Write a protein that binds this DNA or RNA. Structure first.
Lengths: 135, 138
RNA sequence: CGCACCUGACCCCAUGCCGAACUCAGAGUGCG
RNA sequence: CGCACCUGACCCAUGCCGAACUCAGAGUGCG
């Protein structure tokens, strides 16, 4: 919720000033965060459900658990990742963009942050201004 | 399909030159065309689109219209017929250039109503895409 | 070997229209 | 009143996700 507010109040106007977008709907915005937890199953699923607030799908060849977060579950999870999880580790790789505006992070737990930016450069600016700790 | 070829060979490079897009996937591109007794209207609409129309029913269940959402090659084939055959044979002043919805999509009615949905984010870019594809604006 | 992106529809499966979605398939981008 | 866009979440929905399907709501476009 706080992270979402930051998007509207702080990030979106700064993106407009930096890239010259003429309308608000053109500005890059997070679309979804996809979490895949590679691989008892019962326990892994309940933990992933607890941390995302969403029921995981079982991916079968059972080799994985997947959630697609959008809207407020997306923002709430991100806020947890940036404020709680990451700072308990011993910053993000700025080259890990897929060439089409999406960021990939592996922790194995793979996370895809999918944005509506069409370029890595704009996606980078969006995620940096949201407080993703790069470099 | 000739209209599709025209998009890739002629329209997309001209949009790149005019608006300065740095990558091909950023260039505006058609996403879909939505076309909105019953037996007869459905058979004709199916024949001209190559697709099965959905029946819109009152939210009573009496039929109040027919809709088809065309994507991909059925979209291009239908458009080519619309631009080359149907529109110029209207007993015709050209399409209204003010009928963009403010978000890059165009609407016209002939009643047969047609929604042309593009990935352009502004009316100005959508206008350029549809003009270069051969939409005949007045 | 997996997920995301990307591109498709012979194939299991699918649209109360649409391979959009769901399903399946395929050799490059990112990550593990 | 409908379709497209847009914004959401009592019928309904996701083999996860209001993405989709469903439903709802002033605005924009078009009937």
């Amino acid at each position: 919720v706080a992270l979402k507010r930051k998007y509207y109040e702080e990030v979106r106007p700064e993106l407009i000033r930096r890239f010259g977008y003429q309308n608000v709907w053109e500005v890059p915005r997070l679309e979804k965060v996809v979490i895949n937890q590679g691989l008892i199953l019962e326990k892994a699923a309940q933990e992933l459900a607890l941390i995302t607030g969403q029921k995981p799908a079982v991916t079968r060849a059972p080799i994985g658990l997947r959630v697609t977060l959008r809207r407020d579950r997306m923002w709430i999870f991100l806020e947890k990742l940036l404020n709680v999880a990451l700072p308990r580790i011993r910053g993000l790789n700025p080259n890990s963009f897929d060439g089409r505006g999406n960021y990939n992070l592996g922790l194995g737990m793979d996370i895809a942050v999918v944005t509506t930016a069409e370029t890595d450069e704009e996606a980078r600016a969006l995620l940096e201004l949201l407080g993703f700790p790069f470099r």
